[PDB]
């Protein structure tokens, strides 16, 4: 277990989501729906040149799983998934010029539904989320946990839980006031509501 700094800027903006008010916290599922989305578009089009690129899973798509014991929200996709530099350095560095031209936005009149305009869609997990692990696995890479709490740092492990084969989980461990977003029918009514055209099956778990 590996113990990282978000980048300043990133920290920042992950502190805004947190204590910014703002009410309409629900489009926090069409951010990571849609992250979904593209990592499903990258594993389609690089399976189609390379067909063995799918020996990790035919299936393209999106599980979205409630558990009301464990209190967490979890979105799966069979996208491309993250290799550690991706989850260590990468995003967190492509970010920074998102996070900087969002935060000016907001100055300027944008409000926080706006983030996915500026490819930092992810930090939106905050807005429900007092932690938020991801559960990662890329072709020619191992299985990688990454979590955090905020306040500034995020870990990084080698995941030795039960296989995945290839893509994402993020499990959102909900806030204790944000528990209707375990709800069968309030999660329909917001995939309905901003998720309505993705071209993969999403398939929402009950209880
Ligand atoms: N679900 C999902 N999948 C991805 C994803 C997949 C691939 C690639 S890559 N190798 O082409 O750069 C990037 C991806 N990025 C995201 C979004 C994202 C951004 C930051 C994150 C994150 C996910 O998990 C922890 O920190 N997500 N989110």
């Known amino acids: ?22 009410s309409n916290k629900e489009i926090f599922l069409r951010e990571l729906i849609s992250n979904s989305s593209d990592a499903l578009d990258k ?31 979890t979105i799966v996709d069979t996208g491309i998934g993250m290799t550690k530099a991706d989850l260590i350095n990468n995003l967190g560095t492509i970010a920074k010029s998102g996070t900087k031209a969002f935060m000016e936005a907001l100055q300027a009149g944008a409000d926080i539904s706006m983030i996915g305009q500026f490819g930092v869609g992810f930090y939106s997990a905050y807005l429900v989320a007092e932690k938020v692990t ?16 905020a306040g500034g740092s995020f870990t990084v492990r080698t995941d030795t839980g039960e296989p995945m084969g290839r893509g994402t989980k993020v499990i959102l461990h909900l806030k204790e006031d944000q528990t209707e977003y375990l709800e069968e029918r309030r999660i329909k009514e917001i995939v309905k509501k901003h998720s309505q055209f993705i071209g993969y099956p999403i398939t929402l778990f009950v209880e």
Not at 1 to 22: D, G
Not at 45 to 73: A, C, F, M, V, W
Not at 134 to 149: F, G, L, P, R
Request: aromatic share 10%; net charge negative; hydrophobic share 35%.
């Open 134 to 149: 991801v559960i990662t696995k890329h072709n020619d890479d191992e299985q990688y946990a990454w979590e955090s709490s």
């Open 43 to 73: 594993i389609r089009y690089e399976s189609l040149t390379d067909p063995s690129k799918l020996d990790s899973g035919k299936e393209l798509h999106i599980n979205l799983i409630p558990n009301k014991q464990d209190r967490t929200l």
């Open 1 to 22: 277990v590996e113990t990282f700094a978000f980048q300043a800027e990133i920290a920042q903006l992950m502190s805004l989501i947190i204590n910014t008010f703002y």
